[PDB]
Each structure stands twice: as C-alpha cells, then as structure tokens.
Amino acid sequence: DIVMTQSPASLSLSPGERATLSCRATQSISTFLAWYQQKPGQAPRLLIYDASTRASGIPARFSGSRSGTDFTLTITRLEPEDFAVYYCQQRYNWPPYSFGQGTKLEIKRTVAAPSVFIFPPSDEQLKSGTASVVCLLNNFYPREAKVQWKVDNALQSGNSQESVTEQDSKDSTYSLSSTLTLSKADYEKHKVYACEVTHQGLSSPVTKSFNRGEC
Amino acid sequence: NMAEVRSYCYEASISDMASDSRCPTQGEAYLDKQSDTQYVCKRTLVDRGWGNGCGLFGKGSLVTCAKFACSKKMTGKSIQPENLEYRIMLSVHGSQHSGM
Amino acid sequence: YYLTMNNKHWLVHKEWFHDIPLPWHAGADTGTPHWNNKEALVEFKDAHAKRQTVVVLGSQEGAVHTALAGALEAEMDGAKGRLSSGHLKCRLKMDKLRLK
Amino acid sequence: IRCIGVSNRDFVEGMSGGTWVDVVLEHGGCVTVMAQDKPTVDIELVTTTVSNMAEVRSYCYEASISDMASDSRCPTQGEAYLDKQSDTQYVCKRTLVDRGWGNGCGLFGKGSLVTCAKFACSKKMTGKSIQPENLEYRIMLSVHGSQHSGMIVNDTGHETDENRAKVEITPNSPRAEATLGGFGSLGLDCEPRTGLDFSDLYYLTMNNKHWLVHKEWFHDIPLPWHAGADTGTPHWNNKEALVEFKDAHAKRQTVVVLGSQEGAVHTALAGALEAEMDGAKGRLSSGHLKCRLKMDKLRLKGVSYSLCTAAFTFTKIPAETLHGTVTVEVQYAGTDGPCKVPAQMAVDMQTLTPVGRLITANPVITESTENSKMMLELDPPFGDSYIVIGVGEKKITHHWHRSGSTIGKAFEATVRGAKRMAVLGDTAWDFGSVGGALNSLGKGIHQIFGAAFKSLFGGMSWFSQILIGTLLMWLGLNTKNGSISLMCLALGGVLIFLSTA
Amino acid sequence: NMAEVRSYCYEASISDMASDSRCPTQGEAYLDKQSDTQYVCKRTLVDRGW
Amino acid sequence: AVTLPSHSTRKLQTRSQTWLESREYTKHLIRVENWIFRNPGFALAAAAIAWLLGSSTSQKVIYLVMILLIAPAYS
Amino acid sequence: AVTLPSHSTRKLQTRSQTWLESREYTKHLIRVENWIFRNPGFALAAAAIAWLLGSSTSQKVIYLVMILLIAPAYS
Amino acid sequence: EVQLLESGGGLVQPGGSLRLSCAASGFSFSTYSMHWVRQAPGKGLEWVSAISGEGDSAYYADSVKGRFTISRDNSKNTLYLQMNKVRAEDTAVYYCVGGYSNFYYYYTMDAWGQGTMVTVSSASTKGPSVFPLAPSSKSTSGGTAALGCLVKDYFPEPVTVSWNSGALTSGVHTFPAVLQSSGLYSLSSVVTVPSSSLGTQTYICNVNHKPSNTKVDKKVEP
C-alpha cells in the first residue's frame, strides 16, 4: 500500500542551478530508499544508495537527504548531459519494491512562435483508403497541448495520436503530429476543418479554419 | 460393495514455494497465497538488520508457503459385514480318480 | 478395513488405520483433495535463522510396508475383494444325507 | 560489517598482551574480536567445500522384481533346482510345500519349491567418503574499522574494498594471512584436522539431496549394497532384505518386493546435517574451526588523523542488535577528509564522562566529499546514556536506554557458555583462551570427561538422555550413601547436553 | 509512524451456511467448500436412521 | 530390512540444525501416548505386575514406567 | 510422519501366513544387537545403575535387562 | 564487467506463452538475486517478479501473481520468465536486475540489462505503406520546413526506412510503434529541409522490411 509519489514532476530550470526531487511514502519506511537515473533509449542506472552514497563512476554533485518519509535530492550544478528521467525504489521489509512515477527535467527554450503547417490531405492517399490530415506543430513550448478539431462546429476527439519528439540540445525541438482518423464517407460528409495549437507563449491560439480544396 | 474411508498420501511433491518476511516489531509476516488449503505454511523467526533491509535489529517474522501436491496416494476401504460371500466347496467320497 | 496401494491389498485393522501420521483427505472427494494434516511430510528447517528451507520426505511406501507387520493380504478380481484367510461356523445337518 | 546483524555474535576480549588469542569459528555463529590498540575484526566461517570424494558401499532403496520363475520337486524325489539359481543377479529361496496326487505327483508329503526372481535396483543412493586432506574452509574477514557507505555489497571479495578479505584454509597450508589495506595483516593458525572429526563421517547422495552421515550408522543399513566404484549394473550383495517370499497355502509362492525405502531412510536420519553441492564439491552448512589469531602485524589505521570539527547528521536512527550493542550510522557533513569521529557514551551531560566502552575502536571518516557516511557500534552501560558523536557546540546526541542489568548479562554469558560447552566440548575451553596453566588443565580434565562420557553413553537420543537423567535424579534424591555426587553431576551433564538444542 | 500488528474482528457475520452427513461405517463427510479459508466448519456425530 | 537404525545415536552436535529437528522432540511421546490410548488395559496389567516387583513403594513406579515404555516399542 | 505405528499390536492371528512373518522374529533382536555392538560402554553404564537398584541380586538382572532393552528403542 | 544480455524477442500473441531468457554472465550468479522490472511507454517503471538466491523461493507482484513464473538454472546462470496468460497491459520493456543478497531479496549495487521489446498485437500479416506529408506551397522556395515519409499499418515493428541513401537524416529517428485500434503499427516524425530540392532531389523513402515484402517507391506531394 506504499505508493512512491513524486512532487514535483517537472521543473523548467536552467543547466547550472539546483534541483530538489522528493519521493513520499505512506507507511514508516525509515531510510532504505534508492534513486535511479534513466536516459530515454538507454539502460537505467542508479543515483544514490540509501540516499547518501553513489555507485562506481557517479560524481558527488548529486546527493540526497532523509526527512521522515520524504527524501529530497540535492544537486549542486546541473549539466546539459544529465537531464533525464529519475525514479525511486522501495527496499523495506518484503518485496515487491514500489517504484515512483518518473521525474523529467525540462530546460528553457524559444517560446516565440509555433509552426502553422496544415498538410492538405494529399488526395491520392485519400483514394488509397486512409486520411492523414496532419496538422504539424513544431518548435513550441511546453510539450502539452489541447487540440480540438472543430469539424462543422462540433467537438471531435478520441482519435488524436500524437508523437512528441525528444528535446534538442540548442533549442529543445518539440513536435506534435495531430492525426484525425477518418474514413472516406467521413471525409465526404465533412467540409469545414479547423486545427488548434494552444501555445502557452502567445495570448491567442492561431486557429486556421481552412476549407477543403485550398492550400 | 466396499465403502471408502480416509485415504492417505504416501508420495508427495512440493510445487512452487515462496517465503514472506517481516521487520521486527513492525507486525507479522503474511502471504497472500496463505488463503488456499493446498499451500502448507509455517511461521518462524529470523534475524533482521541493516544489511537485510530493515532499520530495526531483532528477531523478524518469516512465513514460508509451499504448494502441496500428492502424486501417488493409497486408499482405505471399509468392510460391511452384511456383504460377505463365502464359497464352500463340498466333496463326497465316491467314484472319482486322482485326476479329479 | 481394506487398504489399496499400487495393486496390492491388505486386511488392515481399524485402530491401526486411524492412527497413521500421513496427510489424508476424507475419501468422499472425487477431485483435488483438501489434504488435512500436511505437516507430516514437509519439513521446515531454518538454516542459521537467516534462511528457511522446506523439503519433503521420501516416498513412504517402504515405511508403510514395514509398518504392516501383522496384516493379512488379499486379492481383488474387480469390484469384489477375495480374501486369503478367515474362518466360518457351520452346523452340518446330515438328516437328508443318505448313503448312495 | 558482516557480523553485526547475526544473533549468535560472541565478543572475544582479553588477550595475552595482544599477541594471540585462541578462538573457535563456528559455522553459523559470528566472532567479534576487540583489542586495545588494534581495530576490531569480525570473523565468520561461511563455507566448507569437500572436493574429490571417493565412493563407499552404495545402498539401493527402490527395487524392481523382474521376470521370475519357479520349479517344484515331488517329495522323496530329491530337491528343487533351477538353471537360474546359481546366478548372482537373481534372488532365490527354497521352501517346503505340500505336494499330493492332485498336483500331478505320486507320493504324498512335504515337497520342495524354489522361487527365483531377478533383482533389479531402480534408484540407488550413493555414499561417499570424506577425507581430512580435502577440506577447504573459506573465512571471510571483515574489520569494523572505517566502514564504507554504511554497508557495502559483500560479494566484492576482490582486491577492492580493502577493509574486507577472504581467507581459504587448507590442511596442506594451515597458516594464512589477509592483507587489509592500511590495517596491516592478520595471521591465522587454523587447525582443520582437529575439526569435526571427519574420519568418522561419510557423505550420502540420495535423489539430489546430500547429508553428513555418520560412519557407524552408515555401515549398518539392511539394504542391498555393492562395492561403490561401478556405475553400471552392480552385484548387489544382501538382496534378501528387500524382497519377501510369501507362500499362501503352500500352493503358490509369489515373491513380492517391499516398497521404495526412501521415506523409510529419510525418517532414519534423525541426526544428520543436511549439506548441499555447488558442483563437484560438497558445501557443508555446519562445522567449527579452531583458529589462533596472530595479531602482531595488525596495526590501527587512522591514529594520525585529526578530530572532526562540527556538522554531523543523524540518519538511520539506531537500535539494539540483541546483545546490548547499538549500531549507529552518521553522516559527517564536511569536506575535512580523514577526520576521527569523537564518539563516547556519557551520562551527566555537563561532564561527558565516558562510562560505556566502544566496540568500533578509533572510528575514521574515510571519504573527502561533502557527506561522508560512517557506521559505528557502541556498548552503553545498563541504564540511561547519551550517544555524543561530536565536539564543541554543534554536536548532536541521542538518548539511549539499554534495558538490563550487569548480573543479567552475566547470567546470559553463563547460559551462552553452557550452550557453547554442550555444542563443542573439548574445544570450548579454547574459545577465549589466552594460554596458560588455567585454560589447559580444565581442558585436560574436560578431555578426560569427554573420553569418559562420549565413550560411555555414546548412542543415546534426545529422549533417552532425559529418561536416564530422571533415573539419575531419583538416584541422587534418594539412596543415602557416599556415591551421591556421581548421580547428580551426571544428571546435569546429560540434561544440559540434551536439553539446549 | 505507527505500523500495524494483528488486527482482531469484533463484529462478525455468517453467510449462507451448509451441512452434510455421511452414513455410519461409510467414511467421513467432506465438502468442496471446506477447501477455502473463508469457511469455518466442525465435524460431529449425529443419529442416523431409515 | 525392517530394523532401520536411527541416526539419533550419533547426532552431530553443532550450532546449526539437524535434519529432523521439528519432529525430534514430539516423536516418541506421540508414539507411547497413542499406544497407551489404543491399549487401555495394559496399564492395569503392568500395575498388577510392577506392584509385585521391588516391594519398596518406590521401585514399583520405576518398574511401571519401564514396562509402560518397553511396551509400544518392544526392542 | 516418523512414528509410524506397527501393526503387530493388532495382528490377525489366523491359519494362513501374514505379510511379514519370516522377519517377525528377528526384527527387534537385530536392532538391540546392532545398538549394543555400536555402543559397548552402555553395558557398563547399565551395570553401574542396575547394581544400585534392586538390592536383592535378582531384580538387578531384571533392571539391567529392561534398561538394555529400553535403550535402543527409546519410546 | 556488468553484462546482462537479454533474449526472447519478437511478439506475444494473446493466448500463448513465451519465455524471456536473460543470458546473465560475468559474475557469480549463484548468490546474486535476480529481479524483473518493466518499462511502460509513456508511464513509469513497473516491478514484476523476482527470484531469491535459494532456488525454491520466488515472488511476484500482486497484479501479476500466479501468471509469470521464473526459473534459474544454477549450471547456466540464466533466467526463464514464463509469459503465461499475457494480456494487453504487458506492452512494456522488460529488464533483468541482479544484485547480491545476503538475505532473500536485497541488493546494495544494482545491475541492469538492455531491454526487450514485448508488445501485444492481434492482426494478420501486413506490409508498410507510404503515406506522404508536406507543408504548404507558399514559402517552400528556400527555407526551413517539416515533412516526413509516414509509415503506418505495418507488421511487425520495425520497418527499416531510409531517406535518400542516408542524406536527409537530420530528423529521421527510429520511433516506436504507435498503438492503433487493432494490431497495426504506426510511426510519424518530422525532418529539417533546406527546401531547394523540389524538382532535382526526389523525396523517395526506401521503405524496406524483411517479413512483409512491400517496397513502393513514392514521393511526398506539396
């Protein structure tokens, strides 16, 4: 019944500052905690044994502390090759040890303007059978959005399959491939299409209500 | 027409086992597979410490469960006295030879 | 009683049969048995109060053949059990037995 | 480290000036040796591998009667004879049966019948022999000293983690020396030939299970056996203890085999020690060594270090390790590097008088980072005390109450010594001995008493010892004569020997 | 930071019960619902006639 | 097999556990209690015999105990 | 399980042969003979006890025999 | 060194049973306790099951209890996670964690594997299709844009797709399978173009895969 909860899950900070990540517990786990370091696409490593001592080949810039059931990280200097996903682990009494949730670290980037690519649905692909109205959104911040396809003044959701890319080193390139799964009869019965961006950097979302048969 | 009685097992086999531990003075050990009758179980005390995952040194609580499975068993049957069928052979002395 | 153990039978006394320390079910089961008293075949032994072993004993067929000291054995030709012993009590009314 | 959580940890203190101290390394028990100006070294016997065992007479437990045959002889016409009687792989028994004119014979009387059956063992158990020149005692040495990261993984028995080292003890090389980095080197003087008397012990291998079977028990099993050095189809002497020749009414002689005797032979191992096997070598889970600790090259690491300044952190709130000792973890928040931790046990906090002695002598902070961990062990006195692990004004303390008394620990050590005397016997007088005319005369009269006790009774169970001990207690409670002390000391020396299991 | 120990029940309830007998010198009675740990049971001897 | 010798004659007294440790203490007591429960008249049969022996009002109890213990396991 | 009770308490004494009748006579004698061969000092340990009891030079032999028979099978 | 290789790849059909075999070598694995940790795509890590140093003992989690049983060969130092009764919630990346244990289940220094792509799909044998993607035709005469040869409805994962023999690989990355409403797989990505190639350099993706045999050379259309 001990669920390792993490608070907070994301901190929009700069490389070089400090970062405090805390894992909580319900029962009385005294000190036996273990932090982890997981890069996406690579094998996960640890961070600290008993929140005080690292593994072989990990510097002493990352440490933790013990405060009741909460264990806060103490990071001196943040490096750009160190921002990854971190986890917690239970090693109290008898297993199964309970993992946390996953704490990612984001960096600041350009929040000036997203992309306005629409992609009219390439009619030979519509004659093939499928329909990919890919409203491309790129170079925007943050990675979360709420795309509401206003098709003939109606809310249509439940079929949006996005694909968020990994962060870039210089400008943190984030993509969002919004795709609405429609058939041929759904394309024939609908005329007005509208995409959304929901960019938090601007004060008004650019809703491009393009017509069927334009560019 | 014999009726069956309690049938013992004489050849057993232990299936997949498990053993739950417990920190000392933090409760007692309990298995979730202890709620089946085909799992034998026994509670005991083991040493716990900082190397064993607990923060309180002392005698812990260890409960080991093991699924019991008998392959070959013997069966006892009962004898009803109202179902005995004695066969009595009679043989008079008369015109018979040694091959009879 | 009438024991049945790997195509062998015995005339086992009741007071010997109800005192066997072996795991048994009640005989009225036709499926997976409950196996009352499973603590007579498995052996829970903690090594050094840090690891608990659980091991079963061997097949008790030789230990129960050596325990059947004074039990007569019997055959079985199907649903009936023929005995190889016993005694009757017959009165021979020889009133109609005439000499031929 | 490696001996702080086990409940059978014994403290062996007091030496002959610090030169050597005779100790007994049991298999499950742990030995903590503390000194005056030398670091505390914890010893624990881990494994005992017996390599290259030759086999002895290997019994069979589950037989199988093959295709049998039988032949009868008429009375006053000779005796019965078969062509498969003279073979040694066939069992045979002659008997006298009733034979008459109905059976085809021509002379009434007692005949002669021989029933022959081929004996075929299915699964046999193999008993091996253990030679005293094959024992490989592994000894894990681990000093308390400057403990690293609180507790490290104990699988790193390599050249790293210089506070720990492994010691392999052979009777071909009974002396050994473990190089501890900074701590010098501890010398061992183990005598594995005077161990668990392995000339009278065998090694049974029965259905992927192993044991430590006594020799006199193993030479007395009524089962079919052979020489031992043949893996094919053996000769199987003494086949008549597994087959049974039963004739119903002298008409038909069916020979039937007894069942699989594996359950009957698991119940016959009422005092064996179960061992395991990690390959060609049989690892024991029991035993005891006999080791003298040459400590002349054991020097204390970190005496030249300075003290700490301030800023300790009290993580891993301590507890009692079932003996009165308090294992305390600290986190020195400071980049001073090799500093010495000011730990002492003190009532009356204005005075800070050290009242309780310290187990981990000369504690040393090792890492030169910000937060260097440490794991200590202190022995507080009985009553109230404080764990003052700092100096100056930024020190942190911890109240500890060790429940008990001095006479309670004296009675506990007396009970522990009585169990140690009942387990080991003659070797128990050299568990904390320093040598002299007091720990050798008592050992000599105990060796005489062991020769007059182990040879006298020598074959009693747990229950029979208490059964004759109640009779000896009745003989001591009555029968007013001069021989009244011989029936009361032989009551206690039996009941302590067979009650403290 | 309190951890729990053996927790007792003080208000119980009995669900749908069941009972079954076996003939004298015909074995001992047994149920398939005896093979669960959430069922209490007790063996006894009662009179049995035609 | 029938006469298997028991290993409790030469049990290896160490700190660790033996093979049969849980069923070691309550093994013979269960046997003698079950046999004296299955044969009720042999206590009176021994008390008719052991009262004749000794004739000292204290050896009769010893003879009764030795007969009552020699009776389940005959040897 | 270890204490399997023997069926010779309630042996069906009939005309035909039983299960183990040939190994019925030499079943306990081999056990007490092997136990007294493995431990020769227990005969002297029994002679030191049974001479103290009895005190009539006739019940001492009964004490010695029943101690030497109660020793292999403990019961 | 730390070498925990994993095997038993491919796909798991609903209703069968497979084995994840971790080839653990390089340490004394007769004492190292072995564990199994999942990696769910989009969610956190999940603890599945583990085996103690003693052979008989083995524990699992309460959500996967009685389904996944493990076996350790002491002469091989290997694992066999029996994947019995695999449901749709087992679409994750399994690992093998090995650490030294004085007690039953403990570790002071942990080891890790490389992962195993285990997904659940119930469909027939399909080939990868070529779906185009292009920006608007108003500022494509010199600049930066975003496009990409979309590969959906393929079976199994992945399909080796290149871009002009290894030239336009500035944004092309091997993305995992986007889960559809059936057993079909999908992937989508963006790319960075200099846009001075309409008419000279053809945007043909070499969509080649071994067990599907579907190679259609197509171009995106603005």
Inter-chain touch C42–B40, beta carbons under 8 Å = yes
Alpha-carbon separation of residue F44 from F41, F64, F68 (angstroms): 5, 10, 10
Class of domain G1-75: mainly alpha
Q: Could you identify the residue written with the tokens 């069906």? A: G12
Inter-chain touch E3–A28, beta carbons under 8 Å = yes
Measured CB to CB, residues of chain D less than 8 Å from chain H are 151-155, 278
Chains that touch H (3 or more CB pairs under 8 A): A, B, C, D
Selecting from H106, H114, H146 the residue whose C-beta is nearest the C-beta of A91 gives H106
As beta bridge partners, residue D23 has D291
The 10 Å Cβ neighbour count of residue D113 is 23
Inter-chain touch B50–D329, beta carbons under 8 Å = yes
Alpha-carbon separation of residue D46 from A150, D137, D285 (angstroms): 73, 8, 8
Q: Minimal Cα–Cα distance from F52 to chain D, Å?
A: 20
- In this complex, is the C-beta atom of D474 within 8 Å of any C-beta atom belonging to chain F? yes
Q: Is there an interface between E and G (3+ Cβ pairs < 8 A)?
A: no
Resolution (A): 4.1
Method: cryo-EM
Q: Is there an interface between E and A (3+ Cβ pairs < 8 A)?
A: yes
CA dist., res. H99 & res. H94, Å (int): 17
Chain D residues within an 8 Å CB radius of B10: 263
The phi-psi region of residue H33 (left if phi > 0; otherwise alpha if psi is between -120 and 50; otherwise beta) is beta
Burial of H23 from C-beta contacts in 10 A (0-12 / 13-18 / 19+)? middle
Sheet architecture: strand order including H58-60: H58-60, H47-51, H32-37, H97-100
- Cα angle at D491 between D487 and D493, to 5 degrees? 120
- Which amino acid, A140? F
CA dist., res. E34 & res. E38, Å (int): 9
Q: How many CB pairs under 8 A join D and G?
A: 53
- Cα angle at H35 between H31 and H38, to 5 degrees? 165
Q: Minimal Cα–Cα distance from F66 to chain D, Å?
A: 10
Which one, of D328, D310, D479, D501, lies nearest residue D399 by Cα?
D328
- Which amino acid, D130? I
Helix (H, G, I), strand (E, B) or coil at D35: coil
Torsion, Cα D293 D297 D298 D302, to 10 degrees, reads 180
Comparing alpha-carbon positions, the chain E residue that sits nearest to C30 is E32
Which one, of C36, A70, C82, lies nearest residue E28 by Cα?
C36
Comparing alpha-carbon positions, the chain B residue that sits nearest to C83 is B86
Q: Are strands A34-38 and D201-205 parallel, antiparallel or unpaired?
A: unpaired
What's the token pair of residue D375?
Answer: 């794991």
Chain A residues within an 8 Å CB radius of D316: 30-31, 50, 66
Q: Could you identify the residue written with the tokens 């052996």? A: C43
Q: Minimal Cα–Cα distance from A29 to chain B, Å?
A: 9
Torsion, Cα H194 H195 H196 H201, to 10 degrees, reads 100
* Residue H59: alpha-carbon gap to chain centroid: 26
Inter-chain touch H56–C51, beta carbons under 8 Å = no
As beta bridge partners, residue C9 has C4, C74
Which one, of D416, D418, D421, lies nearest residue D446 by Cα?
D421
Task: Provide CB contacts within 8 A for H4, sequence distance 6+.
Answer: H22, H23, H24, H96, H98, H111, H112, H113, H114
Selecting from B50, B59, B98 the residue whose C-beta is nearest the C-beta of D327 gives B50
Inter-chain touch D322–B56, beta carbons under 8 Å = no
Q: Minimal Cα–Cα distance from B87 to chain E, Å?
A: 25
Helix (H, G, I), strand (E, B) or coil at D161: coil
Q: Where are the alpha helices (DSSP H) in D159-249?
A: 215-218
What's the token pair of residue D116?
Answer: 């022959």
What's the token pair of residue D365?
Answer: 């902070």
Q: Looking at chain D from residue 81 to 110, which residues have their Cβ under 8 Å from any Cβ of chain A? A: none
Task: Read off φ and ψ for residue B76, nearest 5 degrees.
Answer: -95, 135
Task: Provide CB contacts within 8 A for A149, sequence distance 6+.
Answer: A155, A156, A157, A160, A178, A180, A193, A194, A195, A196
Read off the DSSP letter of residue D486: T
Contact D391, D308 (CB under 8 A): yes
Inter-chain touch H56–C54, beta carbons under 8 Å = yes
What's the token pair of residue D194?
Answer: 């005077």
Inter-chain touch D316–A63, beta carbons under 8 Å = no
Read off the DSSP letter of residue A88: -
Chain E residues within an 8 Å CB radius of C34: 30, 34-35
Chain D residues within an 8 Å CB radius of G49: 468, 471-472, 475
Selecting from B5, B40, B68 the residue whose C-beta is nearest the C-beta of C27 gives B5
Which one, of D4, D38, D7, lies nearest residue D21 by Cα?
D38
Selecting from C45, C50, C58 the residue whose C-beta is nearest the C-beta of D260 gives C58
Contact D176, D168 (CB under 8 A): yes
CA dist., res. B59 & res. F17, Å (int): 17
Comparing alpha-carbon positions, the chain B residue that sits nearest to E26 is B3
Residue D306: CA count within 13 A, CB half-sphere: 5
Chain D residues within an 8 Å CB radius of B96: none
Task: Provide CB contacts within 8 A for B40, sequence distance 6+.
Answer: B65, B66, B67, B68, C38, C39, C42
CA dist., res. D257 & res. D62, Å (int): 9
Helix (H, G, I), strand (E, B) or coil at B34: helix
- Which amino acid, H208? N
Question: Which sequence spans correspond to the domains of chain G?
Answer: 1-75
Contact D372, D420 (CB under 8 A): no
CA dist., res. C40 & res. C19, Å (int): 13
